[PDB]
A = this chain, B = another copy of it.
Amino acid sequence: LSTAILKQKNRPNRLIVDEAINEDNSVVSLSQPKMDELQLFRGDTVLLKGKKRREAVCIVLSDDTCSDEKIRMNRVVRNNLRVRLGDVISIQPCPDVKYGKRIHVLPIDDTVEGITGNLFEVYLKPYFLEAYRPIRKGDIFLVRGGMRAVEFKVVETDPSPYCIVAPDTVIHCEGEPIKREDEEESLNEVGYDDIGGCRKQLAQIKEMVELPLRHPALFKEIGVKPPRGILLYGPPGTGKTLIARAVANETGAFFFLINGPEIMSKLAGESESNLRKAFEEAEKNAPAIIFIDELDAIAPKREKTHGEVERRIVSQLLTLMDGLKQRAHVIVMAATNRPNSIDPALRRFGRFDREVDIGIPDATGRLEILQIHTKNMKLADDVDLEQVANETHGHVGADLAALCSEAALQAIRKKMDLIDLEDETIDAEVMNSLAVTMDDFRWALSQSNPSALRETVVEVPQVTWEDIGGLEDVKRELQELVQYPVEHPDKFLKFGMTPSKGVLFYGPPGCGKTLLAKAIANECQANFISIKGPELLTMWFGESEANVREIFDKARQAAPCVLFFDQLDSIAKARGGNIGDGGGAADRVINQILTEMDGMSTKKNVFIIGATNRPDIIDPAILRPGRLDQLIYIPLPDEKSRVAILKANLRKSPVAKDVDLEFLAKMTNGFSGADLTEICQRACKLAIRESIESEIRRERERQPVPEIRRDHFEEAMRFARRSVSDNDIRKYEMFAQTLQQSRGFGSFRFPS
């Protein structure tokens, strides 16, 4: 019901835009049954609606090729109406068109160059001679002939704007030629269709700025005054200023733009004078819309503001929107990154009554955004925008635009050999072959990350699941953890349960916790934020808690996101055991983490993963299911896992075939993964020492070791040691057996 405004409902007037085979710039062709339904005779002047407040006039024609549900037009009228292929436009009979007395015509500057003959005589005179072609202001049409075809833009027509060009009517092309960039920018205008995702938000905005203007009679009849204030808030890059541009481009209302800091002035009372001048200019202009970009810049809380000028400006805004004298139907929109920074008196019904959340788009929303951004791009056949939409988990639309731009720039980079920057021009063949393919989009996807996570970007050493030896069950569980809620949510909605979103890795040092986190960061299809434990702590009072809150908010925005704490035992610990820690800053941080993982806020697809050497000291509430639901124990590998670890370390290593890894794994009882990696590194280093001494011998005689042999591994094992002791294993197994006793029974079976 919210998007009821948006639906077209398939009215008869709308017809699909189609290519016209023979119709010239001033005529259109429609099917005979469709005209019979519309009661239109041949040659009738018919008015065409267009997007962005554009309209076109043409002469209807009876075409058998044209379908009843379609209208055939050339590119000229399509340009005039600002529409693309497959769009639906209105047609209505145009009443009382009067023959023109005089029209002022201006050509496009890029066309006028290279034409020695007079443009009016060569082009306009034969084109318009006995033409009987209706024209409208702002309509760009093309005339063939001469060396180069010269487009003509009719700036002025009389009677304004509907007239029929006739031989008696005076036509002239004298004046400054229209800048090609001006017409291009007119084409490059934002509309409600250029807004992707946020369909309900756009529906609300259209109900609140477009609906009262189109049909005031609704609100005069039902006897209510529509909302007069819009606050757009969301993370940066979600489309707040884009929605403002769309509204400005395609509303008949007067639009006044206020940029936040532009109000400020050094003179006393000059800022308030600027605000009053803006509001008075809007009020003079009947229905008007005032957009205040960056509202939080000039609307801070009066109680928290220190400077008097800022508070006086906030008060001026307060009295302007809702004071003793009421606004004369002036719509006030504003956009802000920080809605909670705004003065609370502004956020009531009289001033900013409706707050619209332009949030992070979902998969379908971001597919729509990708289609909008690539509608003008040249895409190859293998491009698949649905897959790109699936991959980009945290992107907000500015990130999608960045992805498309980087894909196109990669497509251009593929042509560097054929293109020389010293060369003044590029070949036609290079222009034709240049296009964006799926490979470029995949590369851009590899480069792309959400902008909100730029601050939390950490280089991960590119570990793969195969780099980890053993831990097959843990690998499967981590992959399922990250994948099932993302790719298969309807399964959870069918079974009616939310996914678990927490895992704790506890085990001896060197056994593969951080390695599993690296494998997740590289292989899992989710955003990844990596946190060293004590990095969130700050000297200031309340700032460590703010850092925890901020990192959790970043994870929430970028969902599905994996939040990894490499050393959980630092930031999370049992409360009440720290004598100092500031003023209980450590305990307050723990409580903040507790409220973040499980509080009264709704749950998102944020997976918190923690690794700890010593799991006994972590706060018991942190371990509670719903916060780190699963406690995974990463123990010392057994012989099969030791074989797998040794093989995973030596896969790239050129190692002798006669080297026996099974014997090594058998002898290395009690060794961790770091221990076996150390054995392999020692063997590599002994081989390198041997090769260096052989090369030194060759150099001396002038004035070897392709692979790692059994003797190298023998000596490496001779210097090998066991890193984790039996007491450490005893305490880890003690924690594991406490959990096992918590299970309460050896085997659970339902009675038969």
A207 CB → nearest B CB, Å: 7
A297: nearest chain-B partner, CB-CB: B315
Interface string of A307-327 (1 = CB under 8 A from B): 111111101101100111100
- Given A221-B434, A224-B409, 9 other A-B residues pairs in contact with their CB atoms under 8 A: A222-B377, A248-B324, A266-B268, A268-B307, A302-B338, A344-B455, A459-B602, A582-B583, A626-B677
A280 CB → nearest B CB, Å: 12
| Choice from B293, B349, B492 contacting A398 with Cβ under 8 Å | B349
Q: Are B539 and A541 in contact (CB under 8 A)?
A: yes
Report B-chain residues with C-beta under 8 Å of the C-beta of A348: 236-237, 398-399, 451
A326: nearest chain-B partner, CB-CB: B245
Interface residue? A717 (CB, 8 A): yes
14 A–B pairs (Cβ distance < 8 Å), ordered by A? A1-B410, A245-B324, A259-B324, A484-B692, A497-B685, A514-B600, A564-B600, A570-B591, A576-B617, A579-B581, A583-B586, A620-B724, A713-B750, A720-B743
A403: nearest chain-B partner, CB-CB: B349
Considering residues A577, A624, A724, which has the most beta carbons from chain B within 10 angstroms of its beta carbon?
A: A624
Interface residue? A151 (CB, 8 A): no
Q: A417-B4, A537-B541 given as contacts; is B722 within 8 A of A742 (CB)? A: yes
Q: Are A495 and B405 in contact (CB under 8 A)?
A: no
Give A616-663 interface residues, CB cut-off 8 Å to B: 616-617, 620-621, 623-626, 629-631, 649, 652-654, 659-660, 663
Q: A207-B413, A259-B323, A269-B265 given as contacts; is B222 within 8 A of A378 (CB)? A: yes
Q: How many residues of A contact B (CB 8 A)?
A: 250
Interface residue? A160 (CB, 8 A): no
Q: Are B262 and A268 in contact (CB under 8 A)?
A: no
Report B-chain residues with C-beta under 8 Å of the C-beta of A702: none
Q: Are A545 and B549 in contact (CB under 8 A)?
A: no
Q: A303-B338, A488-B688 given as contacts; is B620 within 8 A of A588 (CB)? A: no
| Choice from B207, B419, B495 contacting A409 with Cβ under 8 Å | B207
Q: A461-B602, A549-B535 given as contacts; is B226 within 8 A of A409 (CB)? A: yes
Q: Are B586 and A573 in contact (CB under 8 A)?
A: no
Q: Are B291 and A674 in contact (CB under 8 A)?
A: no
Interface string of A208-239 (1 = CB under 8 A from B): 00110011011101111111000000001100
Report B-chain residues with C-beta under 8 Å of the C-beta of A660: 750-751
Q: Are A261 and B316 in contact (CB under 8 A)?
A: yes
Report B-chain residues with C-beta under 8 Å of the C-beta of A271: 268-269
A205 CB → nearest B CB, Å: 13
Interface string of A237-274 (1 = CB under 8 A from B): 10001001100100000000101111011111111100
Interface string of A385-428 (1 = CB under 8 A from B): 00000000000001101101100111111101101111110100
Q: Are B11 and A422 in contact (CB under 8 A)?
A: yes
Interface residue? A80 (CB, 8 A): no
Interface residue? A534 (CB, 8 A): yes
Q: Are B532 and A592 in contact (CB under 8 A)?
A: yes
Report B-chain residues with C-beta under 8 Å of the C-beta of A126: none
Report B-chain residues with C-beta under 8 Å of the C-beta of A624: 509-510, 672, 674, 723-724
Considering residues A496, A566, A659, which has the most beta carbons from chain B within 10 angstroms of its beta carbon?
A: A496
Q: Are A539 and B533 in contact (CB under 8 A)?
A: no
| Choice from B454, B499, B603, B721 contacting A743 with Cβ under 8 Å | B721
Q: Are A534 and B592 in contact (CB under 8 A)?
A: yes
Interface string of A677-689 (1 = CB under 8 A from B): 1101110110111
Interface residue? A340 (CB, 8 A): yes
Report B-chain residues with C-beta under 8 Å of the C-beta of A564: 600
Give A571-600 interface residues, CB cut-off 8 Å to B: 573, 575-589, 591-592, 594-595, 598-600
Interface residue? A276 (CB, 8 A): yes
A575: nearest chain-B partner, CB-CB: B614
Q: Are A309 and B268 in contact (CB under 8 A)?
A: yes
Interface residue? A98 (CB, 8 A): no
Report B-chain residues with C-beta under 8 Å of the C-beta of A364: none
Report B-chain residues with C-beta under 8 Å of the C-beta of A600: 458, 460-461, 514, 517-518, 521, 530, 564, 566
Q: Are A496 and B1 in contact (CB under 8 A)?
A: no
Interface residue? A728 (CB, 8 A): no
Q: Are B408 and A223 in contact (CB under 8 A)?
A: yes
Report B-chain residues with C-beta under 8 Å of the C-beta of A277: none
Report B-chain residues with C-beta under 8 Å of the C-beta of A323: 241, 259, 293
Report B-chain residues with C-beta under 8 Å of the C-beta of A461: 600, 602-603
A685 CB → nearest B CB, Å: 7
Interface residue? A727 (CB, 8 A): no
Q: Are B582 and A585 in contact (CB under 8 A)?
A: yes
Report B-chain residues with C-beta under 8 Å of the C-beta of A670: 742, 744
Interface residue? A103 (CB, 8 A): no
Interface residue? A288 (CB, 8 A): no
Report B-chain residues with C-beta under 8 Å of the C-beta of A257: 324-325
Interface residue? A294 (CB, 8 A): yes
A266 CB → nearest B CB, Å: 4
Q: Are B221 and A682 in contact (CB under 8 A)?
A: no
Report B-chain residues with C-beta under 8 Å of the C-beta of A674: 624-626
Interface residue? A667 (CB, 8 A): yes
A621: nearest chain-B partner, CB-CB: B509
Give A152-171 interface residues, CB cut-off 8 Å to B: none
A689: nearest chain-B partner, CB-CB: B480
| Choice from B222, B595, B598 contacting A436 with Cβ under 8 Å | B222
Interface residue? A117 (CB, 8 A): no
Interface residue? A22 (CB, 8 A): no
Q: A454-B347, A624-B510 given as contacts; is B294 within 8 A of A241 (CB)? A: no
Q: A222-B411, A591-B569 given as contacts; is B684 within 8 A of A492 (CB)? A: yes
Considering residues A207, A480, A588, A751, which has the most beta carbons from chain B within 10 angstroms of its beta carbon?
A: A588
Report B-chain residues with C-beta under 8 Å of the C-beta of A630: 719
Report B-chain residues with C-beta under 8 Å of the C-beta of A718: 743, 747-748
The 5 A-B residue pairs with the shortest CB-CB distance, nearest first, are A582-B583, A537-B542, A264-B269, A297-B315, A534-B545
Considering residues A236, A303, A417, A549, which has the most beta carbons from chain B within 10 angstroms of its beta carbon?
A: A236
Q: Are A349 and B270 in contact (CB under 8 A)?
A: no
Q: Are B586 and A584 in contact (CB under 8 A)?
A: yes
Give A348-402 interface residues, CB cut-off 8 Å to B: 348-350, 353, 355, 376-378, 398-399, 401-402
A739: nearest chain-B partner, CB-CB: B721
A318: nearest chain-B partner, CB-CB: B294
Give A527-574 interface residues, CB cut-off 8 Å to B: 530, 532-535, 537-546, 549-550, 564, 566-567, 569-570, 573
Q: Are A261 and B541 in contact (CB under 8 A)?
A: no
